[PDB]
Amino acid sequence: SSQIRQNYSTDVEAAVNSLVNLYLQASYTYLSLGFYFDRDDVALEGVSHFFRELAEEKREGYERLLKMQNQRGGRALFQDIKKPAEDEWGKTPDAMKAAMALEKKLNQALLDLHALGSARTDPHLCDFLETHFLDEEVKLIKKMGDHLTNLHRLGGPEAGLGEYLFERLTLR
Amino acid sequence: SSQIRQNYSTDVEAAVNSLVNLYLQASYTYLSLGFYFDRDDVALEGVSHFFRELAEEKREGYERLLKMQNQRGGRALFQDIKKPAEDEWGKTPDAMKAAMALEKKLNQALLDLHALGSARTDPHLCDFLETHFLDEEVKLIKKMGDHLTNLHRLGGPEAGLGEYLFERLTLR
Amino acid sequence: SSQIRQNYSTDVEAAVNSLVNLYLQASYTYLSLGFYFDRDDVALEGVSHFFRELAEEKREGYERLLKMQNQRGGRALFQDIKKPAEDEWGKTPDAMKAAMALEKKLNQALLDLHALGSARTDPHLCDFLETHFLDEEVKLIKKMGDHLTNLHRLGGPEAGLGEYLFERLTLR
Amino acid sequence: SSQIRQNYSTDVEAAVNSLVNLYLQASYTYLSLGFYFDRDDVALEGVSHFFRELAEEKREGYERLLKMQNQRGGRALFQDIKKPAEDEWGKTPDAMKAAMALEKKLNQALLDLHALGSARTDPHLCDFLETHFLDEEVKLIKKMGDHLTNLHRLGGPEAGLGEYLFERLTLR
Amino acid sequence: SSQIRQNYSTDVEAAVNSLVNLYLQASYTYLSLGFYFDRDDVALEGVSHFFRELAEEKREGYERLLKMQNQRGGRALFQDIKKPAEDEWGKTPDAMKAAMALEKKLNQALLDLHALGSARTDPHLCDFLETHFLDEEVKLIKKMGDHLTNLHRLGGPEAGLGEYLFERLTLR
Amino acid sequence: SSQIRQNYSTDVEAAVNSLVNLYLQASYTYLSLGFYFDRDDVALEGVSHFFRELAEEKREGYERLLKMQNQRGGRALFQDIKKPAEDEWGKTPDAMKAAMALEKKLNQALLDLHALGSARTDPHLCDFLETHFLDEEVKLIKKMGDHLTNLHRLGGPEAGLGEYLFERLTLR
Ligand SMILES: [Ca+2]
Ligand SMILES: [Ca+2]
Ligand SMILES: [Ca+2]
Helix, strand or coil: CCCCCCCCCHHHHHHHHHHHHHHHHHHHHHHHHHHHCCCCCCCCHHHHHHHHHHHHHHHHHHHHHHHHHHHCCCCCCCCCECCCCCCCCCCHHHHHHHHHHHHHHHHHHHHHHHHHHHHCCCHHHHHHHHHHHHHHHHHHHHHHHHHHHHHHHCCCCCHHHHHHHHHHHCCC | CCCCCCCCCHHHHHHHHHHHHHHHHHHHHHHHHHHHCCCCCCCCHHHHHHHHHHHHHHHHHHHHHHHHHHHCCCCCCCCCECCCCCCCCCCHHHHHHHHHHHHHHHHHHHHHHHHHHHHCCCHHHHHHHHHHHHHHHHHHHHHHHHHHHHHHHCCCCCHHHHHHHHHHHCCC | CCCCCCCCCHHHHHHHHHHHHHHHHHHHHHHHHHHHCCCCCCCCHHHHHHHHHHHHHHHHHHHHHHHHHHHCCCCCCCCCECCCCCCCCCCHHHHHHHHHHHHHHHHHHHHHHHHHHHHCCCHHHHHHHHHHHHHHHHHHHHHHHHHHHHHHHCCCCCHHHHHHHHHHHCCC | CCCCCCCCCHHHHHHHHHHHHHHHHHHHHHHHHHHHCCCCCCCCHHHHHHHHHHHHHHHHHHHHHHHHHHHCCCCCCCCCECCCCCCCCCCHHHHHHHHHHHHHHHHHHHHHHHHHHHHCCCHHHHHHHHHHHHHHHHHHHHHHHHHHHHHHHCCCCCHHHHHHHHHHHCCC | CCCCCCCCCHHHHHHHHHHHHHHHHHHHHHHHHHHHCCCCCCCCHHHHHHHHHHHHHHHHHHHHHHHHHHHCCCCCCCCCECCCCCCCCCCHHHHHHHHHHHHHHHHHHHHHHHHHHHHCCCHHHHHHHHHHHHHHHHHHHHHHHHHHHHHHHCCCCCHHHHHHHHHHHCCC | CCCCCCCCCHHHHHHHHHHHHHHHHHHHHHHHHHHHCCCCCCCCHHHHHHHHHHHHHHHHHHHHHHHHHHHCCCCCCCCCECCCCCCCCCCHHHHHHHHHHHHHHHHHHHHHHHHHHHHCCCHHHHHHHHHHHHHHHHHHHHHHHHHHHHHHHCCCCCHHHHHHHHHHHCCC
């Protein structure tokens, strides 16, 4: 019986905690991706930095969610964070495709939470996601799509050369 | 027949003017609270300043509402501003609880107006409240709840000592 | 039985609280005037700003009075603030005439309070009004009289043109 | 089959492209208005600058829309841009009235697109319009209404004098 | 019967308005080119920026023409702006070739207008085109020719790699 | 068969990955502690900040470990991160005691890894822990012990008052 709680559905409270878990899992996946591309036998510095920056973005994500949960009088419930689906992430096109699929999964969870908040008439939640999450995901999915198009353009039997040039001239 | 008016419901226009009155009443209540704690026999400077700052925040509230009313071609209708419910506000926990109840009443009016604007399909109104009012109230209600928890922690037979320390070390 | 109270008449204490109400009502009237001239079908920006600045001056008025009331060991008693006498204020000459009448009413209340303080031998009150209120009202009534003379000079069948030029070149 | 497209209705995609056309047409109309008032036999510099600035605002409008269309995986489809409805725009009140009607038409298209996005459950679109378009149009329609009120105030047999003074003292 | 008009042929006046239309159409074509290369499945940022900058150059073109038309006492007559000939512009060599053909068409119209002005003995027009248009087109056509030569040099079965390197190292 | 690997035991490689998991779990526990003390019904800002800073310190811990793992030609193997042992952490003495026990567990794992590296004759590992981890833990355990002593000193029936003063004057 939180003293500050006002028109904050338990369904929304639970869905927020599930989204916190998904973002924790996403940060952990990008941690693994970043350190895989820091391996001596992969050695793509710009790719590692790209995924390491995303792990921090996902970290700021669930931290913002947890701040909002407390602002609204909800209660954070933390669950186990599943390990990444892969230990080895292959080459840069395979890794970017996995990151693309992850961000789309996060985007679908955000849109479902917005739809839940609308059904429960929670405008603070809906505007909170609109302000901090929805456009961020749209922009990131666009950038990953641009990267995948250029990587496909740089494909073929010169794929290794293309991988090097992409890291050097697009990702630094 | 305002020349600029476009998809601005009379129900919304009236509800905005009622919310202007509620904010005028809220500012007036915080005026009384601020000067009560400036009394020589109460003498809690940080508490007076806390409530005096809120009276200004409520003032910027109804001024923003009145600006929006004119932007949308609505017409401000001013009614009498009721006096505060109390002349003497007791001790700091009692005053903070009254301020908490006031902000929750304002928040409920904001959420009802948002629900009205959604039913009437008024997205400018809905985004206007989301941008300027809804998060402000959530943040303020959270801060008041934090204050009440610390005041309860500082309660007991040392309540006067606790009241002094709260004003000195949390509210300045 | 305020510990600090020294030669502060209850008649003066009551008259101060009545003057606080009159100043609250005056600020509220100038709020309505300012937003009336911000309407799209009135659209006189300098006139709105002129009255909006006066609402703040009246606000600093009753705040100074309430500070003095506490300094002298008196107790603020807040009453309902009556709405403005008009919802629509006509043209700039009609509005300035109403503001003139309001300031004269405030001035007469100030002079009556000074006369009461003199009869009750309250020199702090009398000097307080002399220092902060009496000259302010004399100056403001003079400026409004100057505005009304120029508005009458700019009257006639070119009144709309005169109203525009007054707002542009005198009031900004 | 855009790789990035996620919950972006084809109805919304088409409506965005239609709104891009309406904004292209609006910019073109304000181009004509600006250069009409730069004619030697009209010669109202502030009026020309007012409409020339609006043509740029409409340009930033459809550019923002086209950026969003690509961000969401939609595809821009450009159609012919219709010429302005008039070659000669009369006097400043007639021109401002036409600009008013144009902005109201744009506002109605924006509100219809928002209603479509809500029906299709597209919160990124709805917040995109709320953030960048809806308040901009409300503010602009208010300013045009203010201009029309002052122009009507400056009307009568001194209309030419009023037109000159409006351009000199309001529009520069 | 413009009061300022002096030795300004109606044939020249009409030809200027036709050139204004051609420049409006050219800007619109470069708008489409710029946003096509901003698509996620094309994703060539330097190419999009190259064509977006040209749309602004064509915009400054017809604005200069319209300013001159008013300076000489001519009257702007705006017609419908035809949509671009293509919705999809293929790869960078195909797009640059289309932009090349467009600039050559604009250059031929400029040279024809200069020839008309010479036949009509209009030295202000002829020098106006010489100062602001003719060298600009010669320089731009040269740069596009340089780009096409390098793109052809970077062709072959490594065309995708060549396209990426051209955008990265020549166009940014 | 990493090309760079030189005298890096598989036992050490595995123990490093286990320590990475323990540090990930430690950061997650301090995340929960920080947001628990940000709850409206706990409301101890300095305590939340204290634990939030520690979550970042543990984050820099496993990041340093993962960097070292790649430097030595080892391979990171990520496992599931267990949730914190508690959802609610009680009062500040109970939370500090849990953080104390956690840091001692981390310290014991560090000392065991150092002992393993010494047995396997891995001086880079041993100096790496000495330089970056061992003194950090000794300092932190000392500070927590100091906090617990002061919290016990501030205990008794004035425990709530003591909790407030500790947060205000030691932890900010
Ligand atoms: Ca919104
Ligand atoms: Ca005196
Ligand atoms: Ca020449």
